C-alpha cells in the first residue's frame, strides 16, 4: 500500500466537511452530523492498486491566508469544491482558489466537484435563488469552469444521499497515482 495525500479546498459551506465525513464514516450519520473533521486515512483499492489515502479539510482556514497554506505540503490531489446551490461559490473558483492552489501545488491534479446536487430539484432552493435572479449551477457550467481552469476532470455528488461520493474518491486516487 503506497500512501497519497488529498486536500479539499473551497468556500465555507461548499459542503466539503460533510463530504469527507460521509465518505470516511462506515455508518451514515442519522443522529448527528459532526461540526468538524480532523483527518482520516482510507484504504482504497482502485483498478487493482491498493492505496492509503490521507484526507484533509481546509474548513475554518478560509480567512487565514498564512495558516491555510500549511495544509498543502506534499498534496498529491486537490478536490476543489463548490455548492450547486451557490453560484457565487462558483464565481470564486478561478479568481481566488485556482491561483492559490497552482502556486502552492504546482502540477498537482485538481478535480472540480459540485457538491449538493440533490438541491438542483429542491423547491425551496429554486425559489430562494429566484429572489436573487439566479438558478442552481447547471451541469455544463460545471464542466465549462473545470475546462477553463485546467482541471483533471469534473464530478458531481450529493453527501446527503451518498450519490457519487465513492466515485469521487476513487477517481481522486487514480489522479494521485498519475
Amino acid at each position: 500500500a503506497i500512501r497519497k495525500k488529498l486536500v479539499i479546498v473551497g468556500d465555507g459551506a461548499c459542503g466539503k466537511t460533510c463530504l469527507l465525513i460521509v465518505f470516511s464514516k462506515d455508518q451514515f450519520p442519522e443522529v448527528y452530523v459532526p461540526t468538524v473533521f480532523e483527518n482520516y486515512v482510507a484504504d482504497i483499492e482502485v483498478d487493482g492498486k491498493q492505496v492509503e489515502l490521507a484526507l484533509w479539510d481546509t474548513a475554518g482556514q478560509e480567512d487565514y491566508d498564512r495558516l491555510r497554506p500549511l495544509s498543502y505540503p506534499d498534496t498529491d490531489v486537490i478536490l476543489m469544491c463548490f455548492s450547486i446551490d451557490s453560484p457565487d461559490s462558483l464565481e470564486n473558483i478561478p479568481e481566488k482558489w485556482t491561483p492559490e492552489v497552482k502556486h502552492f501545488c504546482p502540477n498537482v491534479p485538481i478535480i472540480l466537484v459540485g457538491n449538493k446536487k440533490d438541491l438542483r430539484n429542491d423547491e425551496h432552493t429554486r425559489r430562494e435563488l429566484a429572489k436573487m435572479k439566479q438558478e442552481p449551477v447547471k451541469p455544463e457550467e460545471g464542466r465549462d469552469m473545470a475546462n477553463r481552469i485546467g482541471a483533471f476532470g469534473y464530478m458531481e455528488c450529493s453527501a446527503k444521499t451518498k450519490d457519487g461520493v465513492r466515485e469521487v474518491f476513487e477517481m481522486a486516487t487514480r489522479a494521485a497515482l498519475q
Binding site: 443522529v31 468538524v36 486515512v41 479539510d57 500549511l70
Partner: protein
C-alpha cells in the same frame, strides 16, 4: 488518554452517550446544544491525545532509542511541551465542568448550561497571550519540521526503523509525525466553527448567548494575531533570503 475519558466520549453524540430515558426528559433545542458541546470536548480530548503521542511516543522515544543531537528532535517537535500544558489544562476545566453536572447515581447523564465563561477565561488574559505566542512559534516551524522529518527518514536506517516500529499499531493509523503536526496547526481554526454552532443553539439564556458571542470574537482576534505572527522558517535559510 485514559479509559475513563475514552469511554465517556466513545459515542458519536451526546444523544447516544447519555441514557435514553434521561434523553427523553429534554427539549430538542437542548439536545442539539449538548451535541455540539460534547463534540468540542471530544475533539479537545483527541487533540490532547495527539500531543501526548508527539511527546511521549515520538519525542521521548527518539531521545532514548536513537543518537540524534537533541536539537534535531526539537526541530521535529517544536513547542510540544508548552502546547501539551495549555490544552491539558483547558481539557481539565472542560471535564470538571462536565463532572459537576452529572446526576447523582450516574457517570454519564449530564447537561452543561454554562460554557461561555470557561471559553472567555481560556481565550483572554495571560492564557490567550501564551497561546498566540505559542501558535505563532509552532506554525512558523511547521514546514521546517516536515523537511527535517523527510531528510532523516530518507538518509537514516535506524530512524526509518524506529518510525516503522512505533507507527505499526492500528490505532496510530492516522497519527504519524507529519499528520500530528498538521493536526495541531489545524486545531485552532476549529474553535470558531464549534463555538459558532454551540452559540446557534444557546439562545434560551441571554447571558450565555453573550458569553458565547464574546468568546467567539476572542477566538477570532487570537486567530488573527497568530496569522500575522507567522513567518515560515527554512532549514538553512541564509541571511540574504530573509531580508528580501
Amino acid at each position: 488518554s485514559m479509559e475513563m475519558d475514552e469511554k465517556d466520549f466513545a459515542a458519536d453524540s451526546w444523544s447516544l452517550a447519555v441514557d435514553s430515558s434521561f434523553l427523553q426528559q429534554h427539549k430538542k433545542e437542548v439536545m442539539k446544544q449538548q451535541d455540539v458541546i460534547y463534540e468540542l470536548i471530544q475533539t479537545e480530548l483527541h487533540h490532547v491525545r495527539t500531543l501526548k503521542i508527539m511527546t511521549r511516543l515520538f519525542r521521548t522515544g527518539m531521545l532514548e532509542e536513537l543518537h540524534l543531537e537533541p536539537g534535531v528532535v526539537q526541530g521535529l517537535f517544536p513547542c510540544v511541551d508548552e502546547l501539551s500544558d495549555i490544552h491539558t489544562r483547558f481539557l481539565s476545566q472542560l471535564l470538571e465542568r462536565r463532572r459537576q453536572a452529572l446526576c447523582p447515581g450516574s457517570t454519564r447523564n449530564f447537561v452543561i448550561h454554562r460554557l461561555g465563561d470557561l471559553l472567555i477565561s481560556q481565550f483572554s488574559g495571560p492564557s490567550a497571550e501564551q497561546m498566540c505566542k505559542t501558535y505563532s512559534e509552532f506554525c512558523s516551524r511547521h514546514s521546517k519540521a516536515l523537511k527535517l522529518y523527510k531528510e532523516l527518514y530518507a538518509r537514516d536506517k535506524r530512524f526509518q526503523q524506529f518510525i516503522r516500529k512505533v507507527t505499526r499499531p492500528a490505532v496510530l493509523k492516522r497519527h504519524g509525525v507529519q499528520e500530528c503536526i498538521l493536526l495541531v496547526t489545524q486545531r485552532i481554526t476549529k474553535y470558531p466553527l464549534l463555538i459558532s454552532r454551540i452559540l446557534q443553539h444557546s439562545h434560551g439564556i441571554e447571558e450565555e448567548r453573550q458569553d458565547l458571542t464574546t468568546a467567539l470574537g476572542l477566538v477570532k482576534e487570537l486567530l488573527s494575531n497568530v496569522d500575522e505572527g507567522i513567518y515560515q522558517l527554512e532549514k538553512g535559510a541564509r541571511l540574504q533570503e530573509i531580508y528580501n
